[model samples]
Target chain A: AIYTVKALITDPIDEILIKTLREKGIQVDYMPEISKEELLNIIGNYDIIVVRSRTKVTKDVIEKGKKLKIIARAGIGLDNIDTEEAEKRNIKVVYAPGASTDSAVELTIGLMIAAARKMYTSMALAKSGIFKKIEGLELAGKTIGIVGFGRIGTKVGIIANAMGMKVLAYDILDIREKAEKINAKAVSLEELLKNSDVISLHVTVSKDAKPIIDYPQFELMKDNVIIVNTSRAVAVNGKALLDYIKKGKVYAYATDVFWNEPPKEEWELELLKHERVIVTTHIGAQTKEAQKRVAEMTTQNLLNAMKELGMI
Target chain B: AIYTVKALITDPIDEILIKTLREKGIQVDYMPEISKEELLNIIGNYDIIVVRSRTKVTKDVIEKGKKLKIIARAGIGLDNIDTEEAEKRNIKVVYAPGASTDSAVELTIGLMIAAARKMYTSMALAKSGIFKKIEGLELAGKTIGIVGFGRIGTKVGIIANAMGMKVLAYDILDIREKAEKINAKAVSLEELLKNSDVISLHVTVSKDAKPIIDYPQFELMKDNVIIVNTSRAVAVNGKALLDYIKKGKVYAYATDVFWNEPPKEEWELELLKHERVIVTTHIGAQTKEAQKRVAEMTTQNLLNAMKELGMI
Candidate 1:
């Protein structure tokens, strides 16, 4: 007989996740573009739900998913998932951690170098048939401060150190030993901001969604310092960044995250249009290899969660 | 008594070069916009000539400089100067060699990552207020073949290795020890082409100016291999690269060196317009730090040459 277990995929994910679930005798529905209204109407039918970046598992949806034994995210960042609500209902929440670490780290470094060298302007100029040189800063002999010394942050430090840069790391957790192993100095956020020529953020948002790098933090930074954010959009204060940019304190703000997709706010539009700001549409974890790995990890975690729940 | 020694700067450079020369008892003429015709006509009035990329010291100009004792380029690459003609005329030639090494290496890394991630497209899309994710390749667990294991190549290897990539190095010189130090394997050019996922060229051009990577070299490269060139444009055959890009064998060609500034040829325009090809109009040494270092080194080298010739 066909298994009664049903899974709903609400965002774009590797086909392997769907294939694996079905192969294990579960009914799977692949609806990458499922709207929130339809998802609220049908989420109760599934024993599991899968998502990437697009789907948001709100508290309403979690409460509606009466049969939802597990909620799986195929990539990093659980910001879209209402994990607190799922836990309140005894529903297990799982995500593929470390699967997108390399992709995130690589993009962080790319954004760093691109900001330092004004690569956005270079590409634009080259396309316009202008071969004029844009003088930029060299990273060697410079100091880089990495906030949130997790896997991605530490990996960035390793590459930065190899590029002849002094790596300074700051995290809420005790990562001093990890920092020392990579020849990075563990410091307070204030020390990092004051001393670093470049600052890269890798922190997740707090419960209140307060920005880690707000006006006071910007005030502590060095003149002409570059800031690269590959973390949550809420992790950086957009208005403060613009203020510093106008004040000639921040040389460049290269980011892979935005406060909103397509940027409805006037301030964000102004920031993007600025010559010093380099923007990449939230693509830090978007890679072929990372997607494949995330799918595999998500599938395995889902299976393990199902087994523990005695639902398979 | 007024000093008889004189120098003419025919291209833009740091004012420090002129100041240092004048302080050392030389009559300095700062004419960055000197026309080729005027350069030849007035060359005989000077004992020294300073150049960057703009002024080409051709056989005609060298032949016209009857009073010339020194020709100094305040940057790397002696390609702009006809060094053979200068040697025949017994005029000493000097350039800042390592002054631009770090800048070149940084740009190479930036270009590699940018090409892998299709950053040019990402930037263009973001500017249009579109937030679309672009799938990219991660450098970790991949292989990078560095052609020409010089100062720049060695540094690239160091960073690539730290990023968890296997580094393969090929050079005309015996650089096995240098490769081993960075955990890179020394290999033949053919071996590098066949095995590497990414190939970065750091080699200078041969005397005959023949392309090092022509059709044969392209044939050996793995399918969808990335090729980055920060070396002379003459080092890679543009036609062969275009052919591979068309055949879908090569993935991307990210370059800072172009065949010509403001490409006028149809083939060049086509190549630049290709989605896979990323161009940066020869900005390998265009860094504030690198330019300053080049100026200081150029000034010191000129002083040393003058002392050796008993002309100071």
Candidate 2:
């Protein structure tokens, strides 16, 4: 018997994902973006379902998946995949975490340097044929504050340390081992904010995920402090950021995540009007290396689930 | 009696240069962008002259400076000054060569990471309504080739080394000491071109110098080898680079120097049309810190020359 899998949200996994699963004798249908009617129509045909961040795997899809045994996420976090529904239905959910760690770490450092060198603003002006002579700030002697100090955060700490940046990390947990490993100072959030020239976010979005770096946190930061968000957008307060950026309290804001994916708000577009703001389309883990790792790891987990379920 | 001084090119310079000279009982005139006719008419008035690459101290102007004692350039390269004429007239010429080494080094590294991470193209795209998801190549574990490892090149090697890049350096001189200082490999030009993931040019342009990275040299480069030219455009054959970049051997080219200022030809703008090519106005040493240091150091040189001539 062949196990068939249908994928929604095709952004994460590409040919590599299909080839990996196909080689394992699993029949894979890589339908990235399917409407609810189309998903419900096709649900009965597949034994497994795959998703990234965009697709919602809710009770309706679960009810329709008569033969569904596994739900594989190409990347981390199963927020888009309904855990309660999958758990109630006895459908296993598998995801690849830390697959994009290096990619995220690389981008954080890249964005930090971009902010320091004023690449975003400079390039924007250059494109307009307005050759402006804006002198860039150097990053070697500056201090970088890594908030949360988790997987992606710690990796950034290592690169920043090697690049001659004084790194200070803040986490609720005692990440003393991780801190020492990267030669980063484990300090309080307040201290990190006060001392850093650039601040990067790396905490998971949880129930406790308040807008940690709101106006109060911004107040503690030094003038011209750069802010980077590769983590969830909930880590920062939206309106407060826009206001502070306008006031020149913040120099630049580079983000890979947003409060709303595919922002349609006029207010959201206003931030991009500032030359200092840098944005990518939620590409924290969109690197070829990261994507391949994520796809391979998730598919391997699917095979393990199949073995456990006696499907093969 | 106050020593009257004229400065051509009224670019924004730090007050320290002017202040130090004024305190030495010198009357300074900072006339930027003085027309050649205007300068020619008023050439006999000043006791000392200051220039910053823009003002050409021709033999005619040198002959007219009846009271001129010292000719000071605020930055490096006396190519704009008629050095042989200044010698004949017994006018001392002084310039600051290494004052902007750190600044240029910072920009080089920043541009390297920017190119690798696709920040130049992505940021420019992000500024527009289009948001792209280009996977960035990580800087760590990649080989960086530093062509002409002198002052600025050696500094770039140090930073790239610290950031986990394997650095290969090539220069005509015995650069083993400089290479070992940063733990970079002293390699042949052919080997460096073949092995490096990124190649940066730093050699001085001269009549005897050949195109270090022409079509043949670019052919030796690995696929997707990024080329950064912060030194001079003459180091790389412009037409050959344009062809290779079109063929995709050279992945991306990020440059601070242009053969013609503002890119005279339509072909010059063709590279900019490609998402990979990053261009900037000649801004290698255009940082605020560098400008201040260059001005301050050159003024000190002027003071030294003045003292040697018993002007004080």
Candidate 3:
């Protein structure tokens, strides 16, 4: 009997997963942006399912996946997949969490400099044939606050420290020992929020953390403060940001994730029309280098998991 | 009889000169801006004179300086002073040419990145809260042609080379030895202009070479090439540039010198209207560090000249 694996990838994964599955003689169906209905319709067709952030493996989808032996996320987060439901059904779920740490770290540092120097604004003006001479404040003397000292956040702290920036981190899970070893100061979230010139969001967005940077948080920040979020958009309140910008409290804001992907046309217009926001098309880990690494790692992880299950 | 020293500094200079003169018990009169008639009338009152770029020490002024022993420029270039007439009158002229090399060179490298990445435009957009996604081209693979291998140009070459850019240099007097030492390829002006991805001018402007970047030079340059001039306004053909910008041939243009300082109100409106033009108010060496160094050096030179003449 030919074994079939179903994969749902939210983010752009490396091509290695497909190649590895083919090399192993397993029939693999890759869905990078599977909708809820499409995923439910196909859940019973394969022995394995893979996903990233999109195509949430909800309780209903898991119940419908009668033949599902495994569900996998090609990235760090397994929140999109119903892990408890899959586990109850005797189906294993695996995710490659540390695969994109380096890429995310590199992007965080790049965005910090971009925000500090207003690099994105300069580029747009150059394109429009309106090159204005403006002095960009150097980043060497600034303080960077890293929230959630996980693998990706730790790497960002290391690089920012190397670049002559003071790194302060806050994590509720007690990552202070590791941070201390790297010479990064571990502080309370409230203290980090108030003291850092730049605050970078690296923690997984949770229900409790939803709307973390609301109007009250904005009030705590210094004037001309920069906020960068590459994690989840829920970590910050979009409406509060609109109000903050109106009051000239925030100097700059950048995010690779949106409250809604491909944000509504009007929302995009309103958000992007502001001169202080730097937005990318969800390309935080979309570089060629990052893609290759993520693909290779995910493929290896899937094969390893299959071998452990005596299925490969 | 006490010899009086009147220095009409058109541009701001360090206070060290005034302090040093006062310490020596010499009467010193300092005027930041001096009219032509005022300068001519006051020429005979001082034994020594000092200037930057602002005050013109014309031939007629030299003729009126009955007791002028020395004419000093706090910064580089004696172009604004009539060197030939000053020499004829035995008026020893001195200038601090090396004081601003590092600052100007650093700014040049920064501006190059600014131009290549469209930093100014992106900065403006970022400031306005517009989160526009832009793909920036890397500079490592491009060829940078530097005209004039002076102190400033050489420093820029070092940084550019360090960043993995190929450096090409053109100097009228053939300073190939310095270029070779710095690992920069020596190229003809025509070749450099035609093939370079970015071209920076560092040559001093003279009447003979006024508006060197005319229609012919612009045509010779590659389409969408970046042009930067920190040397002088007369080195660039402003009218030709206005026309070339319409054709999309010039990618970006940046300069530290304006055709007229605090340009005439009408000219200012016209110049400021070009969004592609980066103007810096002639602040190539206006950093705090550069200011202190130039002031100390100028004062030292003035004191030395007086000592040599047994007038200190």
Per-residue CA lDDT of model 2 for B1-312, tens digit only, reads 854454443334567877887787677777777778888777788767887766788999988878777888777677788989899888889989888776677677667767777776666566566676777676667899999988888877876776668999999889987798778999899999889999988888774577877878988899998888889877888888888888877778888776665666777777655677777666677766677778878888888887787776
Pairs in steric clash, model 2: A9-A32, B10-B32
* Chain A only, candidate 2, TM-score: 0.87
Give a tens-digit lDDT track for model 1, residues A217-283: 9999999899999888889889999999999999999999888878999999999889888889888
Clashing pairs in 1: none
- Evaluating just chain A, the predictions reach TM-scores of 0.92, 0.87, 0.86
User: Model 1 segments beyond 4 Å from truth?
Assistant: A1-3, A29-42, A53-55, B1-3, B35-38
- DockQ of all candidates, in order? 0.80, 0.45, 0.10
Which has the greatest TM-score?
1
Candidate 2 per-residue C-alpha lDDT over A33-117 given as tens digits, one digit per residue, 9 for 90 to 100: 6766788887877777878767778888888888888888877677778889889988889989788786677677777766766
Model 1 lDDT tens row, B52-169: 9889999989888998989999887687999999999999999898888999999999999999998878988998999998998888999999999998999999999999999999
In model 3, state the lDDT of residue B212. 70
Model 1: residue B212 alpha-carbon error in angstroms: 1.6
What fraction of the reference structure's interface contacts does model 3 contain?
0.03
Q: What tier of docking accuracy does candidate 2 attain?
A: acceptable
> On residues B1-312, what C-alpha lDDT tens digit does candidate 3 reach at each position?
865445444456677888788787877777877777788988887778888876888999888988888888887667788999988999888777677765566456556645554445544544354545443334544788998888777766765664546889998777788888878888898999988888888877676676878889899999878888777778887778877876788877766666765555554446545666665555566555566777888888877888887787
Ranking by DockQ: 1, 2, 3
